[PDB]
Amino acid sequence: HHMRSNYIVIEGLEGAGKTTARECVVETLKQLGVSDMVFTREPGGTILAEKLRSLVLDIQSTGDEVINDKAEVLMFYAARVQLVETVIKPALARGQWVIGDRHTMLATLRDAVLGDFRPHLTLYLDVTPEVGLKRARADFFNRTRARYLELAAQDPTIRTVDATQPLEAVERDIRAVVNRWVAEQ
Amino acid sequence: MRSNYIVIEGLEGAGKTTARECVVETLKQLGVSDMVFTREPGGTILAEKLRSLVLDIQSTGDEVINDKAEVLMFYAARVQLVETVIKPALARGQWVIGDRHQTMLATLRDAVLGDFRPHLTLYLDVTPEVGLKRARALDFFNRTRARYLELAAQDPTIRTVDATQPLEAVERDIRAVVNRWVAEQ
Numbered sequence: 001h002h003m004r005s006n007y008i009v010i011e012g013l014e015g016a017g018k019t020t021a022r023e024c025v026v027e028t029l030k031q032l033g034v035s036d037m038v039f040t041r042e043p044g045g046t047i048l049a050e051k052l053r054s055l056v057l058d059i060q061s062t063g064d065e066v067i068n069d070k071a072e073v074l075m076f077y078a079a080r081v082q083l084v085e086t087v088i089k090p091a092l093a094r095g096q097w098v099i100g101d102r103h104t105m106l107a108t109l110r111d112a113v114l115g116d117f118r119p120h121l122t123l124y125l126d127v128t129p130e131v132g133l134k135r136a137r138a139d140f141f142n143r144t145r146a147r148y149l150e151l152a153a154q155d156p157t158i159r160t161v162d163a164t165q166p167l168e169a170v171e172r173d174i175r176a177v178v179n180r181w182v183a184e185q
Numbered sequence: 186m187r188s189n190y191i192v193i194e195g196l197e198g199a200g201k202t203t204a205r206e207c208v209v210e211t212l213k214q215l216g217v218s219d220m221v222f223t224r225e226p227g228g229t230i231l232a233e234k235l236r237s238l239v240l241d242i243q244s245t246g247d248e249v250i251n252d253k254a255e256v257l258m259f260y261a262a263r264v265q266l267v268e269t270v271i272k273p274a275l276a277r278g279q280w281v282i283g284d285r286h287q288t289m290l291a292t293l294r295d296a297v298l299g300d301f302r303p304h305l306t307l308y309l310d311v312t313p314e315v316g317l318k319r320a321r322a323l324d325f326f327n328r329t330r331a332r333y334l335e336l337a338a339q340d341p342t343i344r345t346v347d348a349t350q351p352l353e354a355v356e357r358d359i360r361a362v363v364n365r366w367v368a369e370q
C-alpha cells in the first residue's frame with residue numbers, strides 16, 4: 001500500500017542519545033512496513049550548510065571579524081530552508097519518509113520562510129539535569145528543557161520520551177509512541 | 186553632535202558613489218569630522234565570503250540555491266554590517282554614509298533590525314531610461330522607481346534629488362539637501 005510519507009524529527013538536549021534513538025525509530029518504522037526513507041542531519045544536511053560551516057570557521061580562525069549572533073541565526077535558517085526545499089520536501093514527494101536529528105524573533109522567521117511547513121511528528125528526548133551532568137563530564141539548560149516541555153504539552157504533534165532510562169526501556173517507549181501515532185493515521 | 190546614519194539609494198546609473206563624496210564634503214563644512222563609508226552590497230568580510238560562496242556554487246552547476254535561503258544569506262550580510270560596522274561607528278560618534286541600503290522582504294527587516302532605520306535616506310531619482318544609458322556608459326525598473334518615489338513622498342526621513350540633470354546641478358542639490366537636513370536637526 002506504500003503508506004503516505006511523513007517527516008519525523010528527533011529533538012533533545014545533549015546526552016539524550018538522539019542518534020541512538022533515531023535507530024530505534026527506524027527499526028519500529030521497518031516493523032510497521034515503512035521501507036523507503038531518508039536520514040537527514042538538520043545541523044548540516046546539505047552541501048550549502050557544510051560550506052556555510054567552513055566559511056564561519058574560516059572567518060573565526062583568521063579573526064579581525066566576529067560573526068554577529070543575528071547574522072548567524074539567519075544563516076542557520078538559510079540552512080534549514082535549503083534542507084526543507086531541496087532534500088526533505090522532495091523526499092516526501094517521492095514517497096520517502098524522512099527522519100531528522102535536531103530540527104519571538106525565531107517564531108516570526110519560521111512563519112515567514114517555512115510558512116506552515118512543520119514536522120508530522122516531533123519526538124522530544126527528555127533528559128534530567130543529573131543526566132546532563134553525567135554526560136558533560138565525559139544550569140541554563142533547565143530553561144531550554146522547560147521550553148521543550150511547554151511545547152510538548154501545547155502541541156499534539158510533539159511526543160516526549162524519557163531518555164534517562166535504560167536502553168531497552170527507551171526502545172519500548174519509542175516503539176509505543178510510533179505504533180500509536182501510526183495507527184492514528 | 187549626535188552621530189548619524191545617511192543612506193544613498195537609487196537605480197543603477199544614478200551615480201550614488203559620486204553623490205556619497207558630495208555628502209561627505211557638505212558634512213565636513215558643517216564641522217562633521219569623523220565618519221565611515223559603507224557599501225551595503227558587501228561591506229563586511231562575511232558579505233564578501235557569502236558572495237564568493239554563491240558564485241562558487243554557481244560555477245559547479247551541480248547545486249541550486251533555494252531563493253528563500255539566498256535572501257536569508259542576503260539579510261545575514263546586512264545584519265552583520267549593521268551590528269559590527271554601522272552601530273559601533275555611530276556609538277563612537279562617527280557618522281556613517283552608506284550606499285544602497287515582496288512584502289515578506291520587509292517582514293524580515295522588522296524582525297531582525299527592529300526599529301533601526303537610517304536617519305536620512307537620500308534618493309537619487311533617474312528615469313529607468315536615463316539610468317540605463319549612464320550604466321552603459323524595463324518593467325522591473327519602472328515598478329521599483331514608483332516604490333522609491335512613493336516612499337519619498339510619504340517618508341519625512343527621505344529626501345529626493347533629481348539625478349537626471351547634469352552632474353554640476355546634482356552636486357548643487359545634494360550639497361543643499363544635506364545642508365538643509367542637518368540644520369533641521
Ligand SMILES: [Cl-]
Pocket residue numbers: 013014015016017018019
Ligand atoms: Cl546526544
Ligand SMILES: [Cl-]
Pocket residue numbers: 196197198199200201202
Ligand atoms: Cl550608481
